[PDB]
Structures are given as structure tokens and as C-alpha cells.
């Protein structure tokens, strides 16, 4: 009834007992040393420890420590020192490993939540996920895991209750074992489903505003769109948004259109205005639409794919907004290759530069009309360079999402490695719970129990190979 009882499997000659022992010591010491190195690197790098997105690492390594050191300690008090273990110390030894596994699963759970918030709700990530909140969540998860592991030590064994208990694990009631297996299994299944959903949704959503989803060329697409709108070929301007006063300057655009209608250039200019709002501005837009044959107004609901096609067909996009906090319209237009004539206010200033669009003073219809005339004059020459610059600038803003998806993929890899390592052991434990066993199952369980140490070995390798920040910190410490 000793922890890590090696008395079984007398097949091997005592000659290789020393080899097995030295291999076990080397593996345990290597795991402990690399876990300590990872923890030191994390703690001594101020950039790394202040990022919640990496906090899971600081948890996992600690868990990898808890399951490693104890093992080495649990190997010292049996072979080199023959000190027999009582019930309480054996329960503590098993509780350490169970707490380590539960902490690993909980760290993966918290990391999955953080990844979902970071990838699919970016606009909230810097506010919902703060460092104190992440620290509190990780501490709560660790305390929950510790309590679950300590429960048998507080009176949930098969001696105090006087009930039938497991064979592979003495002094441990089967009901507690079944409860722990069920908890970890349902948590792992939910984490797997969450990671699959996150990865699939990120794949289908992030790579949407791209030119690869359209067929043909720019000129033929624009000609077909204008034919569908019953207009001749010309320099096309597009406005999409809200019909209101104060947020988006659709009134400014209408005044600029009225000003430009008195010139001779208005004959070689097409306008599309898309949106819904107050009846007054919609009526003004419809009056302009019926007055001029090169102006089109759409108030209905447009599908995402139709807007994507529109962005990849028109020449310029006008964004005369008074208050634009994010400028996602500009981001989509520049991703799909459309030169933006946007107001220089809010979040449009840092997205658009003087070589990747035109910037306009907010709330000045005359200045907007002058900028539109400048864009029309610029359209006389080639414009492919501006489209390429806009695409490059727009893709420059999508790097963070790609890094987040890479971190999510790394987490999925860590999760699948954990599943492979801890699979057969949990299967044998369930077979223990459901029914009886033979000596062969006990032997294979004792042989497969080293997969936990292999997992603790390979986790730092994954962390070092995947994340560039940890490598940079490690080289900085050297």
C-alpha cells in the first residue's frame, strides 16, 4: 500500500533496476529544473508577467512543478530511503498530483475564456480582461483545485466511511474517484468544444474582407455594378452608414453633393449612399437621387457579402464622420482596396495617412467637395499604387488578431498533448470505477503512469518552441 509500489513486475532483472532508477531521477530532475527555469524567466520579465494572455503559462509551469517535485520526493522515500508511508502522507502525495492535473485543466479553461474574449470581442478585451481580474480568477481556480484534491484528506477515504474502495488506489473511496473523473472529463470536453468553436469562428470571420472571394477584375466589376444600377461608367464614390446628425456627416455629404452638382465635373461622377435613419435625411437623399441620374440611394438592409462586393467595385469611399472612434468602415474599405476620403477626426487619423487616402476637415461641406474634386482629378492617372498601399496599411492593423489566433492554436496543441498524456490513465481509472481488474491492468497502469512526467517534460518544450516572447526573454536573461 505504498505510493509508487515497484514490487510488482518482477520480469526485469535486478541488473536494470539501477538503470530504471537513474532514468527516473534524470527525468524528474530535468522536469524540475526546466519548470524552475520557465518560472524564473516569466517572473523576471516585467513585460511577460503583466500580460494576462500569458498568465496561463505561469500557472501551467507551477502545476508542472507540483507533479514533478513530489514524484522525485515520492521516489526518495521509497528506494534510496525505505521509509514506509502512512495513510495521511500517501493521501497528500496523491492529492498533489490530482491538484496538479486539475490546475492544468482549469488553466486551460481560463486561457480558453481569455482567447475567446481577445479574438471574438476585441473592443472589450482591454477592459473586460484586466490583470487584477485575471490574477483573481487564476487564484480562485487554483484554490478550487486544491480543495478538490484535499477533500479525501479531510474524511473522504474508505476507512473512516468504512466503504468499498479502489484497488489501484488504496485508502481512496470509489465515489470520490468517480466524482473527480466526471468533473475533469466534463471540463476537458467543454474546453475542447470551446477551442474548436473559437478556432472555426476565427477562421471563418477574420479572413472575410479579402479580394480572393471575388471573381473578375476591378474595372469589369465596377462596370457590372453600374449597369445593375443603370448608370454609365465613371469615378464612383461610396458612402455607407447612419442617416443622422452629429455622429456621421451624411448631411455634410449631401451638402457637398449639392455644391458639386453646379460644376461640369459632376457629369463624370457617380455617387452611392447606403443607410437608414431619420425620415428627413432619407427624403433629402431620395430627392437628390431623383433629381440627378448619377446618384443612387439604398435604404434597405444589405448583406455582408453584398457590401464586400461593393467595397471591391467602387473607387473611393467617403467617411465624413464627426465622431468615429474605431473607423471599421475605413478598415474594411482599405482591406478590399478602396481609397478612403475620410474626415480627420477620432480613429480615422491614425488609420489613414497622406499616401493611403485623403483626410478632410470635419463639418466643412466646401472642404469635402474640394477633396472630392481632388480625388477625381487624381483618378485620371493610375491608382493601383494607392490600392496596394491601402491594402498594406489595412493588413498592418490585423496583426494582433493573427497573433491571438496563433496563441489559441498553441493552447489547442497543449490541450491535445495533455489529453494524449492523461488518456489511458483516466481510462484505467474509469475501468477501476466500473467493475474489477486483473493484474495485467494494474501493470499497464503502473507503466502508463509515467506519461504524466512525460507531459511535464514536454510542456516547457512547447512553450519555448511556440512563443517568441518567452524565447526573447530567455535570451535577454542570458
Amino acid at each position, epitope marked *: 500500500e505504498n505510493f509508487m509500489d515497484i514490487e510488482c513486475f518482477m520480469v526485469l532483472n535486478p541488473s536494470q533496476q539501477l538503470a530504471i532508477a537513474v532514468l527516473s531521477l534524470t527525468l524528474g530532475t530535468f522536469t524540475v529544473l526546466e519548470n524552475l527555469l520557465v518560472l524564473c524567466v516569466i517572473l523576471h520579465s516585467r513585460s511577460l508577467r503583466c500580460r494576462p494572455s500569458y498568465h496561463f503559462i505561469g500557472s501551467l509551469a507551477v502545476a508542472d512543478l507540483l507533479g514533478s517535485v513530489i514524484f522525485v520526493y515520492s521516489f526518495i522515500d521509497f528506494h534510496v530511503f525505505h521509509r514506509k508511508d502512512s495513510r495521511n502522507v500517501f493521501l497528500f502525495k496523491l492529492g498533489g498530483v490530482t491538484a496538479s492535473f486539475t490546475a492544468k485543466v482549469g488553466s486551460l479553461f481560463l486561457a480558453a475564456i481569455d482567447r475567446y*474574449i481577445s479574438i471574438h*470581442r*476585441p*473592443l*472589450a478585451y*482591454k*477592459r*473586460i480582461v484586466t490583470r487584477p481580474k485575471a490574477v483573481v480568477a487564476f487564484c480562485l481556480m487554483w484554490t478550487i483545485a486544491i480543495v478538490i484534491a484535499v477533500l479525501p484528506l479531510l474524511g473522504w477515504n474508505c476507512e473512516k466511511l468504512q466503504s468499498v474502495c479502489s484497488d489501484i488506489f488504496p485508502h481512496i473511496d470509489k465515489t470520490y474517484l468517480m466524482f473527480w473523473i466526471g468533473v475533469v472529463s466534463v471540463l476537458l470536453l467543454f474546453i475542447v468544444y470551446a477551442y474548436m468553436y473559437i478556432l472555426w469562428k476565427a477562421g471563418i*470571420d477574420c479572413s*472575410f474582407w479579402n479580394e480572393s472571394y471575388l471573381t473578375g477584375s476591378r474595372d469589369e466589376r465596377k462596370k457590372s455594378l453600374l449597369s445593375k444600377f443603370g448608370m454609365d461608367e465613371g469615378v464612383t464614390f461610396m458612402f*455607407i*452608414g*447612419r442617416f443622422d*446628425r*452629429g*455622429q456621421k456627416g451624411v448631411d455634410v455629404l449631401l451638402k457637398a453633393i449639392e455644391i458639386l452638382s453646379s460644376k461640369k465635373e459632376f457629369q463624370e461622377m457617380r455617387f452611392i449612399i*447606403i443607410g437608414k435613419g431619420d425620415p428627413e435625411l432619407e427624403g433629402w437623399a431620395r430627392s437628390l437621387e431623383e433629381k440627378h441620374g448619377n446618384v443612387k440611394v439604398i435604404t434597405e438592409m*444589405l448583406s*455582408r457579402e453584398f*457590401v464586400r462586393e461593393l467595397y471591391g467595385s467602387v473607387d473611393f469611399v467617403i467617411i465624413p464622420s*464627426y*465622431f468615429e*472612434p*474605431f473607423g*471599421l*468602415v475605413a*478598415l*474594411e474599405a482599405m482591406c478590399l482596396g478602396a481609397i478612403p476620403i475620410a474626415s480627420a*477626426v*477620432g*480613429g480615422l487619423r491614425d488609420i489613414i495617412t497622406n499616401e493611403t487616402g485623403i483626410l478632410v476637415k470635419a*463639418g466643412d461641406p466646401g472642404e469635402l467637395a474640394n477633396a472630392i474634386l481632388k480625388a477625381l482629378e487624381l483618378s485620371r492617372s493610375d491608382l493601383s499604387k494607392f490600392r496596394e498601399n491601402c491594402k498594406k496599411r489595412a493588413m498592418s492593423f490585423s496583426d494582433q488578431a493573427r497573433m491571438d489566433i496563433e496563441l489559441a492554436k498553441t493552447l489547442v496543441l497543449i490541450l491535445v498533448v495533455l489529453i494524449i498524456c492523461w488518456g489511458p490513465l483516466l481510462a484505467i481509472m474509469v475501468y477501476d470505477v466500473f467493475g474489477k481488474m486483473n493484474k495485467l491492468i494494474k501493470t499497464v497502469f503502473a507503466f502508463c503512469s509515467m506519461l504524466c512526467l512525460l507531459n511535464s517534460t514536454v510542456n516547457p518544450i512547447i512553450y519555448a518552441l511556440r512563443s517568441k516572447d518567452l524565447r526573447h526573454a530567455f535570451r535577454s536573461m542570458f
Partner: nanobody
Amino acid sequence: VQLQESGGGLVQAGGSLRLSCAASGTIFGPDVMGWYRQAPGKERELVAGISNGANTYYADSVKGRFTISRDNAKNTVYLQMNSLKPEDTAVYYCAAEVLDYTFAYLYHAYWGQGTQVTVSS
């Protein structure tokens, strides 16, 4: 979501007030917050807007006088005005915009009950 408004009331000309608006959302609540004003016999007008930090917007009639701030601990917005004028008497509304990232054209707007502000000389 739901928005609770407070701080309206009568005041002497040239005074100073601060209204507060608290949102109750699922995840971060609103992404953009704003204060609108409606004078009697007049159209509703946006008086202030904010997203986070120094991303605020102010109407030309309150530039330099009003100040909008946001607290993420309680997810609430404050609007503090100094040197009030009789022209500033109106009903103030709190607006909250939750906008999508995968489609810039999609958004949802929520409004408050509105509170009266009367500057009297």
C-alpha cells in the same frame, strides 16, 4: 441593456453640474457612450460622446465647457459641465452603442429615460 440616469435638476446661471449614467450589459455593456440633449421645440442633438480614454467628442457649443469621462470599474459615464448658460436648459439623454467588429454597418443603440436640466437666471 438598461441605462440608469441621475444628476438632473435646476441650477443658477453660471453654476456647475455632473450627471451620471450607469449601464447594465452582458459583456462590457456598451462600446460607445454618449450624451444627447433636446431643447423644448427643438430636435435632439448629440452633446458629447466617448469610447475610452481621450477618445471623446464634443459639440461646438459645449467645447471647452463640458467634460465627459468613463469609469470601467462600474461601467458608467459622467458628464460634468461648468459655467452653465440659460441656453443649456434641456432634457438630457444617455445613449449606449454596441457595434459589431465583423460588420461595421451593424450596430445597436439604447437610450435612457432622460433628465431635466434647467439653468435659471
